[PDB]
Amino acid sequence: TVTSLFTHHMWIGGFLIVGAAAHAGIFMVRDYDPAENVNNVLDRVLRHRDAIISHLVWVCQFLGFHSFAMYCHNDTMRAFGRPQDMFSDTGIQLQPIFAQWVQHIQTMAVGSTTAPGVASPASYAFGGGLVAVGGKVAMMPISLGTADFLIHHIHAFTIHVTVLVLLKGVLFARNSRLIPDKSELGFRFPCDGPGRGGTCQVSAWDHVFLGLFWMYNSIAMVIFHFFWKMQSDVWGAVDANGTVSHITGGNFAQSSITINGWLRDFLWAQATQVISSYGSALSAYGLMFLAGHFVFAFSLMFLFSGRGYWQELIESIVWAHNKLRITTAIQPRALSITQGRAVGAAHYLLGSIVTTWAFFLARMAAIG
Amino acid sequence: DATQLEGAYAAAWLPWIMIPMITYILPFPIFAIAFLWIEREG
Amino acid sequence: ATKFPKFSQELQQDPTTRRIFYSLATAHDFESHDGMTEESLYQRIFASHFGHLAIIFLWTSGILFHVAWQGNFEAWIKDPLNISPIAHAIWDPQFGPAAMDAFTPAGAGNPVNFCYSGVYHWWYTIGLRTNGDLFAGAMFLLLLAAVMLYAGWLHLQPRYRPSLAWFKNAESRLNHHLAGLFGVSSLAWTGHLVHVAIPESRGQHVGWDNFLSMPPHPEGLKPFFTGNWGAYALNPDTSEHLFNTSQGAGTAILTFLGGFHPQTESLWLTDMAHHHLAIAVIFIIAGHMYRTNFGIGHSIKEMTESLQGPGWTGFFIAPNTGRGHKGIYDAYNNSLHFQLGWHLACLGVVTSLVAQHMYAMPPYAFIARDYTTTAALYTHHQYIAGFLMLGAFAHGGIFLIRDYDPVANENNVLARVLDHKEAIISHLSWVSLFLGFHTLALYVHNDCEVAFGSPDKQILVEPVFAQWIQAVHGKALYGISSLLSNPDSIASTAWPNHANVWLPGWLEAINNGTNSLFLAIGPGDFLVHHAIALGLHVTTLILVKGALDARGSKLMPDKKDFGYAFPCDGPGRGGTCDISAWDSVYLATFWMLNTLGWVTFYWHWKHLAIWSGNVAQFNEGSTYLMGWFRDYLWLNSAQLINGYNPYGTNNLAIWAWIFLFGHLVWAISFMFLITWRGYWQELIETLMWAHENTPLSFGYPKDKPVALSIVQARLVGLVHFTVGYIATYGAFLIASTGSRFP
Amino acid sequence: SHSVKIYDTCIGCTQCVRACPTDVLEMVPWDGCRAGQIAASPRTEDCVGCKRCETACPTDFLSIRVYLGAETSRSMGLAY
Amino acid sequence: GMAHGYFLVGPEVVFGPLKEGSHGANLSGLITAIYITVSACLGISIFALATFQGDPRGTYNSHSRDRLRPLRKKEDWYQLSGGILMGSLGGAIFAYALLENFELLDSILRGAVNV
Amino acid sequence: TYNSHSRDRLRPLRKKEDWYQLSGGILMGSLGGAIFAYALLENFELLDSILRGAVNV
Ligand code: F6C
Ligand code: CLA
Ligand code: CLA
Ligand code: CLA
Ligand code: CLA
Ligand code: CLA
Ligand SMILES: CC1=C(/C=C/C(C)=C/C=C/C(C)=C/C=C/C=C(C)/C=C/C=C(C)/C=C/C2=C(C)CCCC2(C)C)C(C)(C)CCC1
Ligand SMILES: CC1=C(/C=C/C(C)=C/C=C/C(C)=C/C=C/C=C(C)/C=C/C=C(C)/C=C/C2=C(C)CCCC2(C)C)C(C)(C)CCC1
Ligand SMILES: CC1=C(C/C=C(\C)CCC[C@H](C)CCC[C@H](C)CCCC(C)C)C(=O)c2ccccc2C1=O
Ligand SMILES: [Ca+2]
Ligand SMILES: [Cl-]
Secondary structure (H helix, E strand, O other): OOHHHHHHHHHHHHHHHHHHHHHHHHHHHHHOOOOOOOOOHHHHHOOOOOHHHHHHHHHHHHHOOOOOOHHHHHHHHHHHHOOHHOOOOOOOOOOOOHHHHHHHHHHHOOOOOOOOOOOOOOOOOOOOOOEEEEOOEEEEOOOHHHHHHHHHHHHHHHHHHHHHHHHHHOOOOOOOOOOOOOOOOOOOOOOOOOOOOOOOOOOHHOOOOOOOOHHHHHHHHHHHHHHHHHHHHOOOOEEOOOEEEEOOOOOOHHOOOOOOHHHHHHHHHOOOOHHHHOOOOOOOHHHHHHHHHHHHHHHHHHHHHHHHHHHHHHHHHHHHHHOOOOOOOOOOOOOHHHHHHHHHHHHHHHHHHHHHHHHHHHOOOOOO | OOOOOOOOOOOHHHHHHHHHHHHHHHHHHHHHHHHHHOOOOO | OOOOOOOOHHHOOOOOOHHHHHOOOOOOOHHHHHOHHHHHHHHHHHHHHHHHHHHHHHHHHHHHHHHHHOOOOHHHHOOOOOOEEEEEEOOOOOOOOOHHHHHOOOOOOEEEOOOOOOHHHHHHOOOOOHHHHHHHHHHHHHHHHHHHHHHHHHHOOOOOOOOOOHHHOOOHHHHHHHHHHHHHHHHHHHHHHHOOOOOOOOOOOOOOOOOOOOOOOOOHHHHHHHHOOOHHHHHOOOOOOOOOOOOOOOOOOOOOOOOEEEOOEEEEEEHHHHHHHHHHHHHHHHHEEEEEOOOOOOOHHHHOOOOOOOOOOOOHHHHOOOOOOOOHHHHHHHHHHHHHHHHHHHHHHHHHOOOOOOOOOOOOOOOOHHHHHHHHHHHHHHHHHHHHHHHHHHHHHHHHHHOOOOOOOOOHHHHHHOHHOOOHHHHHHHHHHHHHHHHHHHHHHHHHHHOOOOOHHOOOOOOOOHHHHHHOOOOOOOOOOOOOOOOOOOOOOOOOOOOOOOOHHHHHHHOOOOOOOOOOHHHHHHHHHHHHHHHHHHHHHHHHHHHOOOOOOOOOOOHHHHHOOOOOOOOOOOOOOOOOOHHEEEEEEEEHHHHHHHHHHHHHHHHHHHHHHHHHHHHOOOOOOHHHHHHHHHHOOOOOOEEOOOEEEEEHHHHHHHHHHHHHHHHHHHHHHOOOOOHHHHHHHHHHHHHOOOOOOOOOOEOOOOOHHHHHHHHHHHHHHHHHHHHHHHHHHHHHHHOOOO | EEEEEEEEOOOOOOOHHOOOOOOOOEEEOOEEEEOOEEEEOOOOOOOOOOOHHHHHHOOOOOOEEOOOOOOOOOOOOOOO | OOOOHHHHHHHHHHHHHOOOOOHHHHHHHHHHHHHHHHHHOOOOOOOHHHHHHOOOOHHHEEEEEEOOOOOOOOHHHHHHHHHHHHHHHHHHHHHHHHOOOHHHHHHHHHHOOOO | OOOOOOOOOOOOOOOHHHHHHHHHHHHHHHHHHHHHHHHHHHHHHHHHHHHHHEEEE
16 A cells, blocks of 8 residues: 555656646747746746756756666676776765654654654654564664665656656747757647658657657656565564564675566566466456566567558558458548657556556555 | 797797787877878868 | 878878778768769779779689698598588797697697688588698689789779760679679589589589580480480489489489488578579579660669559559559669668678578588587578668668759658658657567566466467468478378379479478477477567667668758768757767667577577477477576686686687676776766866976977777777677587587 | 658648748749649758658658758857 | 876876876876877867868857957967977876875975984 | 978978977877886886786786
8 A cells, every 4th residue: 555655646647747737838839928027037038948857858858877887887887897897885875864863853853853843853764773563563764875865866867857758848849959949830730750860759749749759758767666665674574573574685785786576586586476476366366467568569569660650551451442342431631740659658558557556556455 | 827928939039019009009000101091172 | 181081181180090080981981082083983983893802702712722731621521521621720929838738639730729610511512521621622712812802903094994875784783793793603502513513523524624524414415405304303312322422422413302402401502503593594594684785675764663553554453552553663773872871781681591590401511410500600691681781771871861852752662661751760669669578578478387386377479470381381390281291182182293302302491300400399499489580670760760761860861961970960959969860870789789699699699509408498498588597608707717727727728818808898898888078178288288288208298198089989989899799609509519529 | 951852642731831940941833733833942051951851741651851960160050 | 288288197196097106106197197198188279170160150159249259369279288398298297296205205304304 | 301401201200390399299208108117117017017907906
């Protein structure tokens, strides 16, 4: 239930935030009036948007090197056999001293201080003690080490590239240096031809399309961070004495700092319960795991291919139909360019989220 | 046992100098030569 | 205007970064080059071929040099079952000592790579016994590459450039290639097999110091000249013959035993020498069919132009084909794209044959027991073959764009298939749809039955036709007493002749249930064969559709005026994305990769279950898709992804790293494949704003930064998808096999 | 520069000229159709290649074709 | 160059593969600064070689109004390349010499040399 | 060859300012390259352990 609630509300929040940018772009093409708002904050943002977007491009690059390429550094150092050179808690330490200090301020505040009224800490996640109910851990301090620094910078990076993709379409929904009359073309149009090099996906709608993928990639890593960190450093089974045996055994601090440990100790290891579920009561989760893989892969047919191939293949199919005199009045046409994009995006999101749903729920319904 | 790179083969000093030359000494001269070749004007 | 590229004035005027990228991917398209005549085109292609052969010889020379200098060839011939062959040495200065130790075997003093190309087995089966032999071969190939380089430089000289009529000579070339590239070369290989390979297989050393001394047979060229040729097939190697030693040896040099050497589990060298001799004689004969300048012989053109009409002097097995094959000779001979797309189809069928034959009839000593080598070689050649078959249809489309003449090919077979192309495309579509619906629905029914706790309710259809073809070759695995399974049948006995002297040796091998020659097949094989059928049919659909609609369709009637590769025709008429013929080879590369994935997944899991002894894993686990997901991908990943863990590194660390590297490249592909050009052009415009307005940033782009073009990014994303797809599976197949079976 | 070709199936509807964002096209007298006009493309050095003129053409097949050619700084639509 | 070669020594001294030992760490930082300097100055030289061909394109064209790029001649760029190389190699070895003698510079700045 | 009427293509430093700038540059570069070779030869034990990966223990 804790996993499902956190994951569900993160997905709802991400989708809602993408729709916010969608409608900020619909306001621009349709409801924005230059004569109404002259030299105000809205006009002045549109009047320096190259600075906004270029600085967002640079910060996304800085965050992408200093989060993910550090993971690649760690992979290379662990494969070389030199873990003293890694960005681990035993190698080059990257302690999040500011969040650790906030955690310490939160556990000092609640003393018998700066919040004398409260007895306990506002959450035990900051510090304080351990609440265990029915043997299992309800809540305990979430220690923040080098792996937490690295994954929070992954989160910052992915949120920033989502903001880049969405804000770029909002700010250049009216016009750009490429197409000076983009508001005349609409909010949802495929392109403006193969000229100027090829203006594919210049609309604001296509930026909502490309930001849906980036919101997926951002929220998936948030829910993965939550699942692994809570499963290795909070959740467990308290014994009579008080010793806590965590579910995966505190392996987030040393395996979640490489990409290989994320693929082996999280994806390969914790998908034991969803693929070994056939014949059990969790077999529907294994079926939906495979179904999500199908729908993800089927999306790539719409995402990688283009419209003219399918319209030219429908020509041969229409010929074969005309020969049998099974011609229909409604003339069969391929899906339009933006509709093929919408279908591919919907299928990718649906399959890729159904997969994670089945993986989370089969795992948590088998090992508690 | 293996504290460093070794060669149990003939002229085992040749990797020691060949890997720097092929991989991080001669490549940036080659990149500069190719860049000057593709950017030269008529 | 830059001076680069010198082959295109229009790309020199290009002020952007597009000309660097378009000069790299249009460099070998000599036809569309500035001031290119047909003669100059053929001559340039000739010299390029010579430089290519030089690269091939330099590559083989380097393989030989690194096995002779850094491998363990002499140490491996002593025990080719318990010693891992070494490719070359590692000199990565970035290794920790834990990786230096992991990549160092027991018998080595440095980090090395284990060879999985099978060249040790091949060189051991053809006579090579020492590092000096390998070094001599490497130095010969170095000098032969120099000879090919000098030949290529020489035929660019004005007194030495061949004329166009020389290049158009399709009768002299076929005679000299059939008899002299396939015949004399195979005759020379039979000569090596009886002078070096079979003697060294028996223990005698033959080199370029005593081969004129040592006769290949006790009666040296006495049985051949006298006519008693059956003496060469007398006293073969006995069953208890130990390779490279004289215990159990024979004296025969050309015998036809059939089956396998029971100790190396490979084809007999006397059989292979006899094979290459019977191939050399037939090919030397076949290279005498066409007339060059001696009066006798055929003319190919007169043979093709004679298949016009009806009657027994005409094309009688299809009399309603109009002008028949008139203009087909000129379509072949004048168009270099027709030839290239034809020869690529021939080579892609031969490469699949190579892959399908060298695992079932292993030709090299102890290569059936090198499991990772066998798997890597099959997967290597099947992927090469899929790419060659993809390029066959690519150049079939490029021929129809560039070289097809509708009036020279008026109402012949080629123009007759271009006429009814909608029937071909719709029937490929029907076969594809039928196969896909039925195979996917059978797999999904089996999934839902096994998941709901009923493995007995699966639909398990036996491949009774292929089980029967297994029986007509002499497989007693099933209850089918068919042709060669029936011991006193017309086919088994050869009633008037009784000369099938291959039958007992071949039935000793097919009934031997431990080799790969005609593996046992069951219900899980039928489904995956139908999946392979679906894959080949959809790849053929995409490629045939794009080749036949290359010259124009109803959505773009004048598509031949726009070229082979062009982005689109704009968003008019509903939108015309991926409308070019190049985009069909683009879209079918994904389907080729998927089909070869299915093929190699099937082969690998079938063989992993056989090699482990637990064949019931593939048998009652490949009929539903979670068995493929869980018992193949998940299960044989545990050793690969533990190549480096938080506790240490074994020698699978590079395969884990390359597995992740391929995942990364494959994911990067989706960036070029899903996101398209205008997004990046607007992003690059903001970057150009940022650079011109930053202090201290004194550089400035000489050529204007632009986003990658539409076709360019399609190619870039496809190259990424391919490279990551090959890297991921190559890392998984080498590590899932080399760990279970070291 | 791109090549914009106008064919004799033109009917002089002017819609290609009105749709051109870069003013490549104009109307010239023809007496080859009953409108008396046909499109022309003199300023084809300005052509970006958007093919709005082809989208605006009502004849089947199009009386105006754009063939994307050598890219210049004008046909790439570069303000930098 | 002096300012640049000076600070470029430090990242490999603290974070490099040789960081477990002082002498090797300072040497790895010195040669990293040397390599980055020689690569950057080779880039400056080939930028000047490729850009200044006839009338250049972009900001180094004669009609350009860029106030932020004032080295308009190729002679300026070659003099800059030579100066950045000289200054950066010298600043790198000055930082290296201060880090090698850190034991002496430390005893000096603590007055331990006045015994 | 350094007369104003000279046609020597192989001697292009026609001014004395070119020759003094050349002398200063050759001096600076040569003294620096000499001490760079000296520093690589003095630390040959370290450069050797680096290029053998002996520093990754
Ligand atoms: C030289 C020339 C030049 C200059 C000067 O001079 C420059 C500068 C800038 C500034 C201003 C800025 C900031 C900086 C930073 O932080 O970041 C870094 C980066 C880098 C890259 C860095 C750079 C540096 C340099 C390169 C140095 C050099 C080195 C050496 C020389 C090499 C060697 C050579 C040999 C021969 C090889 C930038 C940037 C950007 N870029 Mg940019 N650059 C350039 C180049 C280039 C190219 C080629 C490309 C393609 C790849 C690009 C790209 C880009 C992008 C995407 C972006 C972004 O994001 C950013 C921005 O916008 O913000 C906002 N870009 N930039
Ligand atoms: C997955 C399919 C597959 C497999 C199993 C192999 C297997 C092999 N290839 Mg390869 N190859 C393939 C596809 C494949 N190939 C394709 C599609 C191409 C066309 C580009 C090539 C072109 C090629 C060349 C030029 C050579 C080989 C060679 C080899 C042999 C030695 C390498 C090794 O031991 O294992 C490792 C196999 C891997 C796939 C490791 C991943 C490395 C990634 C893929 C690098 C990306 C480069 C590119 C995509 C393909 C490179 C393949 C090759 C260099 C390994 C081995 C039997 C070598 C050989 O012939 O030995 C004498 C050799 O020189 N192949
Ligand atoms: C794993 C696959 C992958 C990778 C590596 C990237 C990488 C990137 N994306 Mg992308 N994307 C992807 C998948 C991927 N994407 C997919 C699947 C989609 C489908 C919708 C998208 C859609 C997308 C959009 C819409 C955008 C991006 C953007 C970016 C850039 C972000 C800036 C940054 O991180 O700087 C750092 C660079 C990296 C993290 C790349 C890897 C660098 C490695 C780790 C270091 C290499 C070391 C060294 C340099 C190698 C040199 C060796 C030499 C021989 C060459 C970046 C290059 C955004 C952008 O442009 O930001 C400014 C942008 O708006 N992506
Ligand atoms: C194409 C075949 C080939 C390949 C793939 C390799 C690969 C390798 N060699 Mg080797 N080499 C080769 C041929 C080859 N060699 C031949 C024929 C000789 C005899 C002269 C050598 C002599 C040699 C030495 C002395 C060393 C290597 C070493 C190496 C390794 C590191 C790279 C290096 O230093 O290059 C060095 C290369 C040379 C000194 C000469 C190379 C000459 C070949 C023929 C060039 C081939 C060019 C190719 C055909 C053009 C392709 C075009 C392009 C599209 C790629 C690497 C595994 C090093 C090693 O052992 O690592 C531990 C080592 O120091 N090689
Ligand atoms: C006997 C005389 C002779 C011979 C030996 C050749 C040989 C060749 N010619 Mg030539 N030619 C000739 C006469 C001859 N020609 C004449 C008279 C003309 C005038 C009409 C021409 C006009 C001509 C042209 C225009 C061209 C050639 C080309 C070629 C080369 C192409 C084949 C190849 O690359 O190698 C390899 C092929 C084989 C070794 C045989 C292939 C058989 C199958 C596919 C493989 C063998 C199967 C077997 C299982 C292999 C296992 C081995 C494995 C275990 C290692 C080849 C070396 C091409 C070239 O220029 O190259 C430089 C080319 O463009 N020729
Ligand atoms: C005998 C084999 C053969 C030959 C001689 C050709 C020759 C030709 N082909 Mg081709 N083709 C082939 C097989 C062949 N093909 C196969 C097997 C395929 C299917 C994959 C194709 C599909 C194909 C298409 C779709 C097209 C051609 C085209 C061409 C022409 C120009 C090629 C070019 O632009 O230059 C040079 C191009 C390059 C140098 C690009 C290299 C990059 C490649 C794609 C990938 C490189 C691998 C990568 C770097 C590995 C790195 C991995 C690792 C380092 C991480 C040329 C006449 C073009 C044409 O005719 O225009 C009308 C064309 O559009 N071919
Ligand atoms: C922006 C700013 C800032 C920053 C700054 C910085 C960034 C810094 C720095 C710095 C640096 C970075 C410095 C440096 C330096 C240097 C030096 C001081 C040098 C040197 C040198 C030398 C002296 C050399 C010598 C030599 C030679 C040349 C030759 C031979 C050898 C020798 C060694 C002798 C702040 C915020 C703070 C504030 C203010 C403003
Ligand atoms: C003809 C030819 C040849 C030869 C070549 C040669 C002769 C070589 C060489 C070489 C050489 C002979 C090289 C060199 C070099 C160098 C360098 C690389 C340098 C450096 C440096 C530095 C870096 C310095 C620095 C510094 C300074 C300046 C200041 C202070 C101090 C210091 C140290 C920091 C051959 C046949 C082979 C082939 C090709 C052509
Ligand atoms: C497959 C594919 C198509 C073809 C897809 C089509 C034509 C839509 C498929 C929906 C089918 C045709 C359902 C319609 C059938 C009728 C509604 C009848 C259904 C029967 C029920 C009433 C029972 C595109 O048009 C396309 C366009 C742009 C990018 C990618 C693609 C793409 O990948
Ligand atoms: Ca170290
Ligand atoms: Cl790991």
